[PDB]
Structures are given as structure tokens and as C-alpha cells.
């Protein structure tokens, strides 16, 4: 089945210039690793190791710039294979 991940940003998906945003992705406890895919960018935009527990991973952006603006989709790797992408997360800058 491989339930698809939940992808969200903190504090919010709309972030002014220079501020911090943290993109969070949640998978299953059996996740081997996570990746972050951005549209019109060569895959993968970033890949990250799981936390403890392996339920969620963390992608952090300390100073939001116009490079980090766009739509991200997170996948996670089970012991069998990669998963269906998360619902898209658009990151608009102001």
C-alpha cells in the first residue's frame, strides 16, 4: 500500500524574505530516508535522513530566498521502494 506522506511547512507556507521556514515531511516508522522534489528543478532537490523515530523528517531553510520558492513534493523510502508523492506544498515568498 505505502501510505503517501504528509508535507507541510512551518511557521507557514508563505514566508517573507530572510526569515526561517521548516518544511516537514511525515512517513511511516519504517522509513529508510526522505527526499524533497521541487518542480522545474532536477530531482532530487534535497534528501534527508529520518529522525528518531523515523516517522518524520526535517528540511530547514534558515533564510528564505527566491530560490526556495515553488512547489515541493516529499517522498519517503520504505524497505521495498519509494512512495507515492505527497500532496504538493507551494512555498510563496513575500
Amino acid at each position: 500500500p505505502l501510505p503517501k506522506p504528509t508535507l507541510w511547512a512551518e511557521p507557514g507556507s508563505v514566508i517573507s524574505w530572510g526569515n526561517s521556514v521548516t518544511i516537514w515531511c511525515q512517513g511511516t516508522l519504517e522509513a529508510r530516508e526522505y527526499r524533497l522534489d521541487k518542480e522545474e528543478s532536477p530531482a532530487p532537490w534535497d534528501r534527508q535522513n529520518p529522525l528518531e523515530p523515523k516517522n518524520k523528517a526535517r528540511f530547514s531553510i534558515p533564510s528564505m530566498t527566491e530560490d526556495y520558492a515553488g512547489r515541493y513534493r516529499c517522498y519517503y523510502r520504505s524497505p521495498v521502494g519509494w512512495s507515492q508523492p505527497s500532496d504538493p506544498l507551494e512555498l510563496v515568498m513575500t
Partner: antibody, heavy 122, light 112 residues
Framework: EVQLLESGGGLVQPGGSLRLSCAAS?????????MYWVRQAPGKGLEWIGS?????????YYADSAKGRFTISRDNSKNTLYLQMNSLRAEDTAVYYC?????????????WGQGTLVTVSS | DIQMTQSPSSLSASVGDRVTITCQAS???????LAWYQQKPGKAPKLLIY???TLASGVPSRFSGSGSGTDFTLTISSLQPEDFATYYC????????????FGGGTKVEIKR
């Protein structure tokens, strides 16, 4: 301390079926671990059969060779792991282990059972 | 699948030697899912290294491992007569459609 105790082994006729048990005596902080079944044929190398995850999903994974013939299940009512072996052939004779790999060790088997011998002969 | 290959299969090293075993993967794996096992004859396997470099509890200090991606090593800095065993590397990265998570093994014999 945690302890993995094995049973169900012995003599069984070719073409028969057998079930090993792995009773996890006690527990420490794991809450997230696998239970592996590994066998060693006489003089041959370690063979991974499959694992079962401790979560509620109870995800089960198997080797390429072991799919269809072997089945891994769990009985939380007794906290015992099972390895159902079907259609046994002579080349299935080996010493069988169960092991525990915790999430904090990135699924590495720090706990190993004593091993039980399954001799497939008429 | 993912074939884990070890080399050499057999080796003869003297006491005090610094032996190095290699473990190859058919594709890159995360180093954190790579472990090393010792198996003295007739005994149960034993955890030596996990995360490809971390010594485990009660494991002698003369043991060490390193590596990343496709190639990993296990090193015995001062070989001992009791270190006669067969050594296996194993991965927990990709299961499913995999024949064996273990390598073939490396039999270490003590020259004398």
C-alpha cells in the same frame, strides 16, 4: 534484559511443514524493532529469511527464495514470533535463528537467539 | 535485487597482523544501515559494528569499520588467536526482491 528463546525445531519429513517459535522474554526500551529469521545450512553462509516489524502494521518482508514457502506471523497474546515453513526439502536443513534489530541501532541485530536445528529427513 | 559482496572469502593472517575485510554493494546504500557480524564456529552470530563505523557493546576496541556508498571495510588492528571466525556484512536499507541481506562471508584463519 531482553531474551530471544527459540523452539519448534527437530526432525520433519521431506514435503512436510514446521513452525518455529521465538518467544521474546522480557523487554527493554525498544518500542520499534524488527524480528529476523536467519538460517545457516551445514557449512554454508548465513541466509536471511525475513523480518517482521513490531508496529501495528506488522509489516512482513521475505527473501526472494523464501516467498510462498515461508510465512512469518506474530502472536501478541503470548508475545511469540512464528516462522511457518511449508513444503520442506532436504536442502532446508539448517540452524535457525531469530534476532532483534531496534530502530535506534538502525535495525542492526544486537540480540540473537541460541539457534534451533531443523533436520529434514525421512 | 541488492547483492552484498565480501572479499576475500578466505584469508590467512598471523597474530598481531592488521587485517582488513571489504564489503561491496551492487548499489549505493546509506551507511547507517550497514552492520558487521562475527560468527565463531557453531555459535550464534554477534554484532560487531553498526552504522558502518560504530563499535557495539562488549566488542573489543581492536575492531573498527569505515566506508560510504558502495564500499565498506572492517579492520582488526591487532589480530588475536580467538578472532578465528567468519565475518558477515549486512544491510537494512532495501529488502524485498532481495536474495540475501548478508554477504557471502569472510573466513579468517590464523597463520602460525
Amino acid at each position: 534484559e531482553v531474551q530471544l528463546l527459540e523452539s519448534g525445531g527437530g526432525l520433519v519429513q521431506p514435503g512436510g511443514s514446521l513452525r518455529l517459535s521465538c518467544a521474546a522474554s522480557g523487554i527493554d526500551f525498544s518500542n520499534h524493532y524488527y524480528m529476523y529469521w536467519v538460517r545457516q545450512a551445514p557449512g554454508k553462509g548465513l541466509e536471511w529469511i525475513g523480518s517482521i516489524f513490531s508496529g501495528d502494521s506488522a509489516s512482513t518482508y521475505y527473501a526472494d527464495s523464501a516467498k510462498g514457502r515461508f510465512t512469518i506471523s506474530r502472536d501478541n497474546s503470548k508475545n511469540t514470533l512464528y516462522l511457518q515453513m511449508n513444503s520442506l526439502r532436504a536442502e532446508d536443513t539448517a540452524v535457525y535463528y531469530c534476532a532483534r534489530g531496534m530502530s535506534t541501532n538502525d535495525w542492526a541485530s544486537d540480540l540473537w537467539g541460541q539457534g534451533t536445528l531443523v533436520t529434514v529427513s525421512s | 535485487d541488492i547483492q552484498m559482496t565480501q572479499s576475500p572469502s578466505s584469508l590467512s593472517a598471523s597474530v598481531g597482523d592488521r587485517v582488513t575485510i571489504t564489503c561491496q554493494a551492487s548499489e549505493s546504500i546509506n551507511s547507517i544501515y550497514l552492520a558487521w557480524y562475527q560468527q565463531k564456529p557453531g555459535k550464534a552470530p554477534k554484532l560487531l559494528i553498526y552504522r558502518a563505523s560504530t563499535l557495539a557493546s562488549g566488542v573489543p576496541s581492536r575492531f573498527s569499520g569505515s566506508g560510504s556508498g558502495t564500499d565498506f571495510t572492517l579492520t582488526i588492528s591487532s589480530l588475536q588467536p580467538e578472532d578465528f571466525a567468519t565475518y558477515y556484512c549486512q544491510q537494512s536499507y532495501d529488502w524485498g526482491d532481495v536474495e540475501n541481506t548478508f554477504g557471502g562471508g569472510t573466513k579468517v584463519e590464523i597463520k602460525r
